[PDB]
């Protein structure tokens, strides 16, 4: 009986040309955004009262300096790579890095880099590895990156040491919000005849089950995407049809917050 809340650190670096660049970042713990990192800011910004976890102020300031130096150095290194490898602007680079702490204290991590929306390389163990079937210039990038023994040591420290300890503190500091349960409210509506539509909004966390008569569920239900609300809740629309059969159909909603008391809405 346990759920996983991985820490995903996302970086969005855009290079319009050699003189216009910006880097923005975010941190997700499970489905909750815990940090925000704007290009016009000197520091990573905490979005939750518990976003610092159990790190001390000095420990957190150390990470601030590491990320501050990393952002400027990453920007400079990309511009040199584009000149070194003769890659034409614009350049779009994304980083997805983090770790997860499994119940029982096991840990594992990841560090994936994308170029123009495609994986090109990742950090595996102590070195950088190219993505399978990657462009030829990535081999030169890997060749240059693995010569940097200080960066390789720092990345390994962050993934294998800093991140698991950070997550462990966050799981305890934000335990109330991470395990919170918010009950959804539902309502029915009409749609263009090909169509019964069942709305479900306001639930937290994200996992939900919605399907359309008594004990028989019409397997032709069309579930939509789980869409976000501004208050960190979620919204889902489910649609369904022969005109005569619609009489007597019902929408059933299963969610963890309901404690077994399913929401049942009958049409009419």
């Amino acid at each position, epitope marked *: 009986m346990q759920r996983l809340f991985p820490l995903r650190c996302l970086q969005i670096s855009s290079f319009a040309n050699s003189s216009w660049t910006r880097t923005d970042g975010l941190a997700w713990l499970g489905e909750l955004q815990t940090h925000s990192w704007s290009n016009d800011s000197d520091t990573v910004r905490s979005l939750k009262p518990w976003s610092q976890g159990t790190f*001390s102020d000095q420990q957190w*300031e150390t990470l601030q*300096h590491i990320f501050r130096v990393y952002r400027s150095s990453f920007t400079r290194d990309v511009k040199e790579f584009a000149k070194m490898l003769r890659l034409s602007y614009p350049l779009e680079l994304q980083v997805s890095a983090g770790c997860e702490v499994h119940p029982g204290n096991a840990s594992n991590n990841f560090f994936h880099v994308a170029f123009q929306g495609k994986d090109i390389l990742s950090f595996q163990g102590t070195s950088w590895e190219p993505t399978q079937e990657a462009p030829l210039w990535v081999n030169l990038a890997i060749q240059v990156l693995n010569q940097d023994k200080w960066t390789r040591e720092t990345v390994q*420290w962050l993934l294998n*040491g*800093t991140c*698991p300890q950070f997550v462990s503190g966050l799981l305890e500091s934000g335990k109330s919000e991470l395990k919170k349960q918010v009950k959804p409210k539902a309502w029915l509506s009409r749609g263009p005849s090909p169509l019964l539509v069942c709305h479900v909004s306001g639930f937290y966390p994200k996992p939900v089950w919605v399907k359309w008569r008594g004990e028989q569920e019409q397997q032709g239900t069309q579930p939509g995407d789980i869409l976000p609300n501004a208050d960190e809740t979620w919204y889902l629309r489910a649609t369904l049809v022969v005109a005569g059969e619609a009489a007597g159909l019902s929408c059933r909603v299963k969610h963890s917050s309901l404690e077994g008391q399913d929401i049942v809405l009958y049409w009419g």
Partner: nanobody
Amino acid sequence: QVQLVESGGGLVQAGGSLRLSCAASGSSFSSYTMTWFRQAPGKEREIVAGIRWSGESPYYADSVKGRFTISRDNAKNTLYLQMNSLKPEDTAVYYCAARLVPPGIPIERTLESMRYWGKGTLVTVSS
């Protein structure tokens, strides 16, 4: 990023005391793991002490426990080594070293990862 300059070395008699200092030039000195190394005549360079953030127990080599104390003044960007009960085997060139280490790493696993080094200061223990 960090430049280190040791000072305070000199001649001292056995059983006496001497204070070494290390002036660091850089941006975020308080974030750096600071260490003292020494190389005795005819012997290999070895770690003496290490210090990081407030509240953490500093590292000490077994040969200097109870005699040497490492400390730092982050407001002055200065690292200190207070050497008491000096022995003739403490004669060495003492080196200041630094490395930016993120949280979650035990200090004893970073003693071989120093990046920036000073040029050393000589301490001679007579008698």
